[PDB]
Design a protein around this ligand. Sequence first.
Ligand SMILES: CCC(CC)CN(C[C@@H](O)[C@H](Cc1cc(F)cc(F)c1)NC(=O)O[C@H]1CO[C@H]2OCC[C@H]21)S(=O)(=O)c1ccc2c(c1)CC[C@@H]2O
Lengths: 99, 99
Amino acid sequence: PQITLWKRPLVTIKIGGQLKEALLDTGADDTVLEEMNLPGRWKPKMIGGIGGFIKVRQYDQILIEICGHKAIGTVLVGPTPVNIIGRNLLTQIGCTLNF
Amino acid sequence: PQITLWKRPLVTIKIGGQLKEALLDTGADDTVLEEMNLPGRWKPKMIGGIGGFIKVRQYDQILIEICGHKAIGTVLVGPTPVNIIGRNLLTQIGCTLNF
Ligand SMILES: CCC(CC)CN(C[C@@H](O)[C@H](Cc1cc(F)cc(F)c1)NC(=O)O[C@H]1CO[C@H]2OCC[C@H]21)S(=O)(=O)c1ccc2c(c1)CC[C@@H]2O
């Protein structure tokens, strides 16, 4: 689907048996989601953005169905104000910017 | 032009007679740029991100040519790690997400 940018590009995702809403974010290199239990194990990690840095749990080879499109990749879990679909997963579903 | 997301969607922008490189960011509602000298008055403001909040200078009605497409809108100047073109300006040049 083509998404206009007049509103926040929010999409419905399926991850770990849970339904959430995430922002298709071309400005994010990594996918970052609010707290949840993503089975499979993890390794501590720190990521930075506007305002500073946050500590996240790096989960790898994690499945996510983004708006009906399936993808597997690294998924950072931590205190993000919001869920973010990063370029690591956007490339897998064939997302592109168009102007 | 169509931009794949295998790499950062970086574009060259022209603002206030200066050439810079900015990240086409669909996750941003407004445009925020690193330190620079923007002629005009401004208004203090506070904006939030993953790591917290930063203080920026709100400049209004600022012309910016993004990849040859001209647009006018608010441009926030502050301690952002990278220049980001937000949705306030992406809509003006006709940007859309396609997957
Ligand atoms: C509410 C959604 C979201 C925040 C939860 C908004 N952000 C836009 C995201 O696209 C940012 C962009 C970025 C920010 C940055 F510091 C450095 C970068 F290189 C890139 N990505 C991000 O933090 O990404 C991180 C995860 O992946 C990693 O890769 C990039 C670095 C790491 S914002 O920049 O805070 C912002 C932009 C405009 C405006 C506001 C806030 C309010 C006022 C105005 O509307």
